Scaffold this motif. Structure first.
Motif, PDB file in Angstrom:
ATOM      1  N   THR A   2       6.522  -7.928  13.235  1.00 34.45           N
ATOM      2  CA  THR A   2       5.401  -7.864  12.306  1.00 34.45           C
ATOM      3  C   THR A   2       5.650  -6.780  11.259  1.00 34.45           C
ATOM      4  OG1 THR A   2       3.924  -8.529  14.104  1.00 34.45           O
ATOM      5  CG2 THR A   2       2.913  -7.500  12.169  1.00 34.45           C
ATOM      6  N   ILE A   3       5.200  -7.037  10.024  1.00 23.57           N
ATOM      7  CA  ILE A   3       5.316  -6.059   8.944  1.00 23.57           C
ATOM      8  C   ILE A   3       4.474  -4.835   9.261  1.00 23.57           C
ATOM      9  CG2 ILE A   3       4.997  -5.697   6.447  1.00 23.57           C
ATOM     10  CD1 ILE A   3       7.060  -7.702   7.150  1.00 23.57           C
ATOM     11  N   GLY A   4       4.967  -3.674   8.843  1.00 24.06           N
ATOM     12  CA  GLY A   4       4.176  -2.464   8.824  1.00 24.06           C
ATOM     13  C   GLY A   4       3.807  -2.092   7.401  1.00 24.06           C
ATOM     14  N   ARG A   5       2.792  -1.242   7.255  1.00 26.52           N
ATOM     15  CA  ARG A   5       2.368  -0.769   5.948  1.00 26.52           C
ATOM     16  C   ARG A   5       2.291   0.750   5.946  1.00 26.52           C
ATOM     17  NH1 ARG A   5       0.763  -4.509   2.061  1.00 26.52           N
ATOM     18  NH2 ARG A   5       0.753  -6.645   2.906  1.00 26.52           N
ATOM     19  N   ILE A   6       2.726   1.351   4.842  1.00 27.30           N
ATOM     20  CA  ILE A   6       2.702   2.797   4.656  1.00 27.30           C
ATOM     21  C   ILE A   6       1.740   3.111   3.517  1.00 27.30           C
ATOM     22  CG2 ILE A   6       4.026   4.879   4.211  1.00 27.30           C
ATOM     23  CD1 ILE A   6       6.582   3.164   4.895  1.00 27.30           C
ATOM     24  N   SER A   7       0.748   3.950   3.792  1.00 23.38           N
ATOM     25  CA  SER A   7      -0.115   4.418   2.721  1.00 23.38           C
ATOM     26  C   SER A   7       0.677   5.244   1.714  1.00 23.38           C
ATOM     27  CB  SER A   7      -1.242   5.270   3.291  1.00 23.38           C
ATOM     28  OG  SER A   7      -2.023   5.813   2.235  1.00 23.38           O
ATOM     29  N   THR A   8       0.337   5.076   0.438  1.00 23.56           N
ATOM     30  CA  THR A   8       0.907   5.879  -0.638  1.00 23.56           C
ATOM     31  C   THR A   8       0.220   7.226  -0.796  1.00 23.56           C
ATOM     32  OG1 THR A   8      -0.646   5.007  -2.279  1.00 23.56           O
ATOM     33  CG2 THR A   8       1.423   3.778  -1.929  1.00 23.56           C
ATOM     34  N   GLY A   9      -0.909   7.440  -0.123  1.00 22.10           N
ATOM     35  CA  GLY A   9      -1.758   8.580  -0.357  1.00 22.10           C
ATOM     36  C   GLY A   9      -2.944   8.294  -1.254  1.00 22.10           C
ATOM     37  N   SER A  10      -2.891   7.213  -2.033  1.00 25.97           N
ATOM     38  CA  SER A  10      -3.956   6.833  -2.956  1.00 25.97           C
ATOM     39  C   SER A  10      -4.616   5.553  -2.462  1.00 25.97           C
ATOM     40  CB  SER A  10      -3.375   6.605  -4.351  1.00 25.97           C
ATOM     41  OG  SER A  10      -4.256   5.844  -5.161  1.00 25.97           O
ATOM     42  N   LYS A  11      -5.936   5.595  -2.256  1.00 23.74           N
ATOM     43  CA  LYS A  11      -6.649   4.383  -1.860  1.00 23.74           C
ATOM     44  C   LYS A  11      -6.560   3.313  -2.940  1.00 23.74           C
ATOM     45  CE  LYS A  11      -9.968   5.536   1.692  1.00 23.74           C
ATOM     46  NZ  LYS A  11      -9.136   6.680   2.150  1.00 23.74           N
ATOM     47  N   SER A  12      -6.599   3.730  -4.206  1.00 25.33           N
ATOM     48  CA  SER A  12      -6.486   2.796  -5.317  1.00 25.33           C
ATOM     49  C   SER A  12      -5.146   2.068  -5.279  1.00 25.33           C
ATOM     50  CB  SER A  12      -6.639   3.590  -6.614  1.00 25.33           C
ATOM     51  OG  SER A  12      -6.646   2.749  -7.742  1.00 25.33           O
ATOM     52  N   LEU A  13      -4.055   2.823  -5.188  1.00 26.86           N
ATOM     53  CA  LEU A  13      -2.734   2.209  -5.148  1.00 26.86           C
ATOM     54  C   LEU A  13      -2.539   1.386  -3.877  1.00 26.86           C
ATOM     55  CD1 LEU A  13      -0.021   1.831  -6.504  1.00 26.86           C
ATOM     56  CD2 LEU A  13       0.699   4.028  -5.534  1.00 26.86           C
ATOM     57  N   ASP A  14      -3.044   1.871  -2.740  1.00 31.65           N
ATOM     58  CA  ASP A  14      -2.935   1.087  -1.513  1.00 31.65           C
ATOM     59  C   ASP A  14      -3.598  -0.277  -1.671  1.00 31.65           C
ATOM     60  OD1 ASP A  14      -1.569   3.171  -0.313  1.00 31.65           O
ATOM     61  OD2 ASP A  14      -3.219   3.753   1.012  1.00 31.65           O
ATOM     62  N   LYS A  15      -4.781  -0.321  -2.299  1.00 30.09           N
ATOM     63  CA  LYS A  15      -5.456  -1.603  -2.492  1.00 30.09           C
ATOM     64  C   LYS A  15      -4.644  -2.526  -3.393  1.00 30.09           C
ATOM     65  CE  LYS A  15      -8.857  -4.437  -1.760  1.00 30.09           C
ATOM     66  NZ  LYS A  15      -9.111  -4.941  -0.381  1.00 30.09           N
ATOM     67  N   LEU A  16      -4.094  -1.986  -4.479  1.00 29.87           N
ATOM     68  CA  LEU A  16      -3.251  -2.788  -5.354  1.00 29.87           C
ATOM     69  C   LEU A  16      -2.105  -3.425  -4.580  1.00 29.87           C
ATOM     70  CD1 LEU A  16      -2.907  -3.352  -8.506  1.00 29.87           C
ATOM     71  CD2 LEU A  16      -1.073  -1.634  -8.355  1.00 29.87           C
ATOM     72  N   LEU A  17      -1.534  -2.684  -3.630  1.00 29.44           N
ATOM     73  CA  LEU A  17      -0.377  -3.131  -2.863  1.00 29.44           C
ATOM     74  C   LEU A  17      -0.741  -4.021  -1.683  1.00 29.44           C
ATOM     75  CD1 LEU A  17       1.440   0.293  -2.889  1.00 29.44           C
ATOM     76  CD2 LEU A  17       2.245  -1.776  -4.057  1.00 29.44           C
ATOM     77  N   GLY A  18      -2.022  -4.303  -1.462  1.00 27.84           N
ATOM     78  CA  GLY A  18      -2.408  -5.088  -0.306  1.00 27.84           C
ATOM     79  C   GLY A  18      -2.460  -4.314   0.990  1.00 27.84           C
ATOM     80  N   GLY A  19      -2.527  -2.987   0.921  1.00 28.05           N
ATOM     81  CA  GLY A  19      -2.652  -2.159   2.104  1.00 28.05           C
ATOM     82  C   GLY A  19      -1.657  -1.017   2.205  1.00 28.05           C
ATOM     83  N   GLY A  20      -0.713  -0.940   1.278  1.00 30.10           N
ATOM     84  CA  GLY A  20       0.357   0.037   1.311  1.00 30.10           C
ATOM     85  C   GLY A  20       1.700  -0.629   1.104  1.00 30.10           C
ATOM     86  N   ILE A  21       2.756   0.191   1.077  1.00 34.28           N
ATOM     87  CA  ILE A  21       4.088  -0.390   0.908  1.00 34.28           C
ATOM     88  C   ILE A  21       4.540  -1.026   2.216  1.00 34.28           C
ATOM     89  CG2 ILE A  21       4.557   1.412  -0.829  1.00 34.28           C
ATOM     90  CD1 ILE A  21       6.965   2.238   0.879  1.00 34.28           C
TER      91      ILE A  21
END
Length: 218
Positions: A2-21
């Protein structure tokens, strides 16, 4: 896996990315000098080390630096201001300077050895940064005939990175200072905005963030 997601530190950027990188993906950030690409890389190198309920993957980091822009004290600052031990966070970043594009390509193949070593420890590699992906290729492959040659070499380099991401469940994060084709899985355009903010847009809404003592945040 399963894919994992890493927060960028920014809630705005995380949302743009679908949850993080995402792991099992190459995320490319591109933009002009000063757009914040390296600050985002530094922040991700801390965030990935957090536990999953805080937006990390309990992961270690491998960093390939082509421009001598990695700053250990920036890692330590971001870590401390997010409540993490600065020296433990720094210790979990394996760091290499790439001297030219051929060395850069070898370093990616070399990274597989440490990835395998750490795969079943409690802090497997979860983030591989190449900053800058393109700078050596741009300096070395120039002039008539260079477009095809440079793109073919970059395609092989990116294929190697895709394999590590996909085989070992790693997020690959690369920077590019900017009609050319690209093979990253996701491309994020970064630029300066008003009030010191940075603005991010997915290429092929916009997130807004600041660069702070915590790395980046809304």
């Amino acid at each position: 896996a399963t894919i994992g997601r890493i927060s960028t530190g920014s809630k705005s950027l995380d949302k743009l990315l679908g949850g993080g990188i995402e792991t099992q993906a190459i995320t490319e950030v591109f933009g002009e000098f000063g757009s914040g690409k390296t600050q985002l890389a530094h922040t991700l190198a801390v965030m990935v080390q957090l536990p999953p309920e805080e937006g990390g993957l309990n992961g270690s980091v491998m960093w390939i630096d082509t421009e001598n822009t990695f700053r250990p004290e920036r890692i330590r600052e971001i870590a401390q201001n997010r409540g993490l031990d600065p020296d433990e966070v720094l210790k979990h970043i394996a760091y290499a300077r790439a001297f030219n594009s051929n060395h850069q390509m070898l370093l990616v193949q070399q990274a597989e050895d440490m990835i395998k070593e750490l795969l079943n420890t409690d802090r497997p590699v979860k983030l591989l940064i190449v900053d800058s992906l393109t700078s050596h290729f741009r300096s070395e492959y120039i002039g008539r005939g260079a477009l095809a040659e440079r793109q073919q070499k970059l395609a092989k380099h990116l294929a190697d990175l895709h394999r590590l991401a996909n085989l070992y469940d790693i997020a690959v994060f690369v920077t590019n200072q900017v009609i050319l084709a690209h093979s990253a899985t996701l491309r994020v355009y970064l630029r300066k905005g008003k009030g010191g903010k940075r603005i991010a847009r997915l290429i092929d809404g916009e997130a807004v963030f600041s660069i702070t003592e915590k790395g980046i945040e809304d």
